[PDB]
């Protein structure tokens, strides 16, 4: 019997219960009965879409902007004092419908905001994201992964994403995967245990082992002592004292000679450990650090023990016929030992005319992969010393000819080789002449062309496009790269190489590529072949 409404009829619920049982002084009741002092603006907001029909954009962005304003209001007027109370009270028709329709970022930002209260709302929204078909895809939060049913499935879909990705996606997805599984070290334990059980199989478990090794490398970067977890997952703990020695040594992150005598007494006997205890890559990286730094002298007595340990790591084969070995061999680790000994002598002698002299023996050595990885780390630690480029022969291409040898005789080192070349190319060399810096960059681009020749092309051209577009280098260097690449290649052309090599050539310095070639035609041939491949160019 009030009859005092403008648009408070939409609030007809709580009004009605305050209408029949009003009593006492209903001043506040009547004031809230007519607190909707505007017109029918809940319908006129729907008429704003009809006005947008005359506007520039009658699309779904208007309802998206209204829902974004509603989400910003629900986060601004978030009921943080009674968040867990309102979570634990109703929760049946509201959170279920909201996760049915508007589960895009609302409850995700709500669980990103506080995440300690509202365990009923967090549990219902987590179970509804579990009811979502693709996953865990809404809960992409480094601190909302503290629930096991959530985190296991998020781990599953991220592993599926990486394992369908490949080596290209190995660089892009792995920090976005590793910030979750290194957030808590117990989550690291869960993830590495899953890596172990999946890498029990020889039918594609090598990529799982690889992803485990990059997660372990990221754990070593961020600050874990994750080597003890790594050895506790391994079979190496079945032979206790060797694994304990590795545990202390990889907890120190450095080589102790007494510790390697403890290892070496257990090796080269008639009962070796299973070779997967020594194949851990952080251990071989500490070997490269302690052995092939240009300083860091090794005291000539347990040196052959070091070389024999690296040779046994990178040499021997085995046949695990139902968890036992019956046929191993040691007949190439003498050549491996001789090669790594010759290379450590050449890195110990530190005399550069001798480095030019024994370069044929060094070319004989880099036929071996562990030798080539070690020479790559040594040339990294030598050439990247500041104020190095002051010996100048053809702007010092000697170590870069060793880069060409490493790139020639192997293929798996090519990411590290490209990483070294793009580390030197980004590095501005002070105290050099600017023409001299420019010819140093021309030499590094000659090395990148040599990497492009041996198959490893797409990250190189991707970097050249990245440094023409983003944060630009000198245009003459890219012109020289295009000039040297197009003086060696010939059709047929794979579509990815055309798709990646087209925009750097056609945009931004057409004219500089052709000056005086004549006998073999310039970029015009590549443009003609690019028109003949694609569907016009598109």
């Amino acid at each position: 019997x009030x009859x005092x409404x403008x648009x408070x009829x939409x609030x007809x619920x709580x009004x009605x219960x305050x209408x029949x049982x009003x009593x006492x002084x209903x001043x506040x009741x009547x004031x809230x009965x007519x607190x909707x002092x505007x017109x029918x603006x809940q319908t006129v907001n729907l008429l704003a879409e009809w006005l947008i029909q005359t506007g520039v954009e009658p699309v779904q962005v208007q309802e998206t902007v209204e829902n974004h304003l509603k989400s910003l209001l629900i986060k601004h007027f978030d009921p943080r004092k009674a968040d867990s109370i309102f979570t634990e009270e109703g929760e049946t028709p509201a959170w279920l419908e909201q996760m049915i329709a508007h589960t895009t970022w609302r409850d995700l930002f709500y669980k990103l905001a506080e995440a300690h209260p509202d365990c009923l709302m967090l549990n219902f929204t987590v179970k509804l994201i579990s009811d979502a078909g693709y996953q865990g895809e809404i809960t992409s939060v480094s601190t909302a992964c503290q629930q096991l049913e959530v985190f296991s499935r998020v781990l599953r879909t991220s592993l599926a994403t990486i394992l369908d990705g490949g080596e290209e996606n190995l660089e892009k997805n792995l920090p976005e995967f590793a910030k979750m599984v290194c957030h808590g070290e117990h989550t690291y334990l869960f993830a590495q245990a899953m890596m172990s059980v999946l890498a029990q199989e020889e039918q594609g478990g090598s990529a799982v082992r690889r992803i485990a090794q990059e997660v372990q490398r990221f754990a070593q970067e961020k600050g874990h002592d994750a080597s003890q977890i790594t050895l506790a997952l391994g079979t190496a703990a079945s032979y206790p004292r060797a694994c304990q020695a590795l545990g202390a040594m990889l907890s120190k992150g450095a080589l102790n000679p007494a510790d390697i005598t403890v290892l070496f007494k257990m090796f080269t006997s008639m009962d070796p450990p299973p070779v997967e205890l020594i194949r851990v890559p952080a251990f071989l990286d500490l070997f490269m650090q302690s052995l092939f730094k240009p300083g860091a002298r090794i005291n000539q007595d347990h040196k052959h023990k070091y070389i024999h340990i690296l040779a046994y790591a990178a040499s021997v084969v085995e046949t695990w016929k139902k968890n036992k070995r019956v046929s191993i061999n040691k007949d190439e680790l003498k050549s491996t030992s001789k090669a790594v000994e010759t290379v450590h002598n050449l890195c110990c002698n530190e005399n550069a005319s001798e480095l030019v002299a024994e370069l044929s023996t060094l070319y004989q050595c880099i036929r071996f992969p562990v030798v080539a990885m070690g020479v790559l780390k040594w040339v990294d630690w030598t050439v990247s010393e500041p104020r190095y480029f002051q010996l100048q022969t053809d702007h010092t291409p000697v170590h870069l000819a060793l880069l060409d040898e490493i790139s020639t005789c192997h293929q798996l080192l090519h990411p590290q080789v490209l990483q070294l070349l793009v580390k030197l190319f980004e590095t501005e060399h002070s105290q050099l002449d600017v023409m001299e810096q420019l010819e140093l960059k021309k030499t590094l681009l000659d090395r990148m062309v040599h990497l492009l020749s041996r198959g490893y092309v797409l990250p190189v051209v991707s970097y050249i496009r990245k440094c023409l577009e983003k944060l630009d280098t000198d245009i003459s260097l890219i012109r020289y790269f295009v000039t040297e690449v197009l003086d060696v290649i010939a059709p047929p052309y794979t579509s990815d190489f055309v798709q990646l090599f087209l925009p750097i050539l056609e945009n931004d310095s057409i004219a500089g590529t052709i000056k005086t070639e004549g006998e073999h035609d310039p970029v015009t041939e590549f443009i003609a072949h690019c028109k003949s491949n694609f569907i016009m160019v598109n």
Partner: protein, 127 residues
């Protein structure tokens, strides 16, 4: 010592960090573990998880001294209704006994079953 549950919650209960903190082998002495064994159901799940992960960072001889008390803490940890404590107890039950962690995590858990089934299919098709 006295009030040792409060002592573990004081030295380990900074919930803003989630790794095993350093000097955890200097915080886990056999007398301290034998003080934990009677007040183990009182302290919080985060501190309990720090404790169970820190029991792996001990050296091998200290684990080999008093592995029975560590197994008792494991058996009390497997009874807790927390998901993390149950899973970490299921992993860590084989570490003081053998030296290696558990690899058979497959029973009593539909989570491990779903992840292993989907990932065995995925690994089988991604060679």
């Amino acid at each position: 010592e006295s009030d040792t549950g409060l002592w573990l919650h004081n030295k380990l209960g900074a919930t803003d960090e989630l790794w095993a903190p350093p000097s955890i082998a200097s915080l886990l002495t056999a007398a301290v573990i034998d003080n934990i064994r009677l007040c183990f159901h009182g302290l919080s799940s985060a501190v309990k998880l720090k404790l169970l992960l820190g029991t792996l960072h001990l050296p091998r001889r200290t684990v080999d001294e008093m592995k029975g008390a560590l197994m008792e803490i494991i058996q009390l940890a497997s009874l807790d209704s927390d998901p993390w404590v149950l899973m970490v107890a299921d992993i860590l039950k084989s570490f003081p006994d053998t030296g290696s962690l558990n690899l058979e995590l497959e029973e009593q858990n539909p989570n491990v079953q779903d992840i292993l089934g989907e990932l065995r299919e995925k690994v089988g098709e991604c060679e």
